[PDB]
Design an enzyme around this catalytic site. Structure first.
Site, PDB file in Angstrom:
ATOM      1  N   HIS A   1     -22.094 -34.170   1.967  1.00  0.00           N
ATOM      2  CA  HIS A   1     -20.931 -34.726   2.681  1.00  0.00           C
ATOM      3  C   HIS A   1     -19.594 -34.139   2.956  1.00  0.00           C
ATOM      4  CE1 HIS A   1     -19.434 -38.365   0.611  1.00  0.00           C
ATOM      5  NE2 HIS A   1     -18.060 -37.825   1.500  1.00  0.00           N
TER       6      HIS A   1
ATOM      7  N   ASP B   1     -26.467 -36.727  -1.755  1.00  0.00           N
ATOM      8  CA  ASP B   1     -25.192 -36.713  -1.545  1.00  0.00           C
ATOM      9  C   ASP B   1     -24.526 -36.157  -3.015  1.00  0.00           C
ATOM     10  OD1 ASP B   1     -22.910 -36.285  -0.237  1.00  0.00           O
ATOM     11  OD2 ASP B   1     -22.240 -38.028  -0.427  1.00  0.00           O
TER      12      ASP B   1
ATOM     13  N   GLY C   1     -11.329 -39.789   0.501  1.00  0.00           N
ATOM     14  CA  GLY C   1     -10.682 -38.960   0.197  1.00  0.00           C
ATOM     15  C   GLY C   1     -10.981 -38.495  -1.399  1.00  0.00           C
TER      16      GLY C   1
ATOM     17  N   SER D   1     -13.985 -38.184  -2.112  1.00  0.00           N
ATOM     18  CA  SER D   1     -15.554 -38.888  -2.280  1.00  0.00           C
ATOM     19  C   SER D   1     -15.679 -36.762  -2.517  1.00  0.00           C
ATOM     20  CB  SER D   1     -15.447 -38.526  -0.357  1.00  0.00           C
ATOM     21  OG  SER D   1     -15.478 -39.623   0.360  1.00  0.00           O
ATOM     22  N   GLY D   2     -17.267 -36.707  -3.046  1.00  0.00           N
ATOM     23  CA  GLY D   2     -17.380 -35.856  -4.095  1.00  0.00           C
ATOM     24  C   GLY D   2     -16.417 -35.600  -5.528  1.00  0.00           C
TER      25      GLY D   2
END
Ligand SMILES: [Ca+2]
Length: 223
Positions: free
Chosen positions: A40, A84, A175, A177-178
């Site tokens: 995402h 994801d 922020g 995320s990942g």
């Protein structure tokens, strides 16, 4: 990261910042040419930033490398965020040193109770907005699936796991995320989603990396 602490310059050498004119997501370096992040977080024109601490000040250990190819998981579902995960290949190999290093992939899945390290440059407020310039860290335990499922309004699949605190106050956030979730020296999770940030009864949900090692290995070997 809400309720965390300042990691310290380059103490999380595998942490990367994805930049498209500004920081928008985190990632993890798994070898000199590949980065793992959340699907995402996909965007065109991604530049990977390594060796970063303060993302707004050139400190002297950074390496800015653009992506030559991005590969979102074949089964990524944008409605549920199932699968994801995304792989990013660098245009050129990163220079590995004491401040830029890769993190190992899991050989087995982690269990509830295990302490993990989550890091990122995401929002630090649960009831507002305040983005840090330096990297933040948070120690969090993996929780039983029930912990996230009980009050969840969304589907939680076998490709996701629960980590954090049920009484709120500490959690990853927008922020982050990942970004990485490292336990026992292995990359076990990728910051994926949650309902709000650090809310009671609502811990964070992370992509379960141990379920993707085969796909990761096959993909990088063929690209
Ligand atoms: Ca910097």
């Amino acid at each position: 990261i809400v309720g965390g602490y300042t990691c310290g310059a380059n103490t999380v050498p595998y942490q990367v910042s994805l930049n498209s004119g500004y920081h928008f997501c985190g990632g993890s370096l798994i070898n000199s040419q590949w980065v793992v992040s959340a699907a995402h977080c996909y965007k065109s024109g991604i530049q990977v930033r390594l060796g970063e601490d303060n993302i707004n000040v050139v400190e002297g250990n950074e390496q800015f490398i653009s992506a030559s190819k991005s590969i979102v998981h074949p089964s990524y579902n944008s409605n549920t965020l199932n699968n994801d995960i995304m792989l990013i290949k660098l245009k050129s190999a990163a220079s590995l040193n004491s401040r830029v290093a890769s993190i190992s992939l899991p050989t087995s899945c982690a269990s509830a109770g295990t302490q993990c390290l989550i890091s990122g440059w995401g929002n630090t407020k649960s009831s507002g907005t305040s983005y840090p310039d330096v990297l933040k860290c948070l120690k969090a335990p993996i929780l039983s699936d029930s912990s996230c499922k009980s009050a969840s309004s969304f589907i939680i699949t076998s490709n996701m796991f629960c980590a954090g605190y049920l009484e709120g106050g500490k959690d990853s956030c927008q922020g982050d995320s990942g970004g990485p979730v490292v336990c026992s020296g292995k990359l076990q999770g990728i910051v994926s989603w949650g309902e709000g940030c650090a809310q009671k009864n609502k811990p964070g949900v992370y992509t379960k990396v141990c379920n993707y090692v085969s796909w990761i290995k096959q993909t990088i070997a063929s690209n």
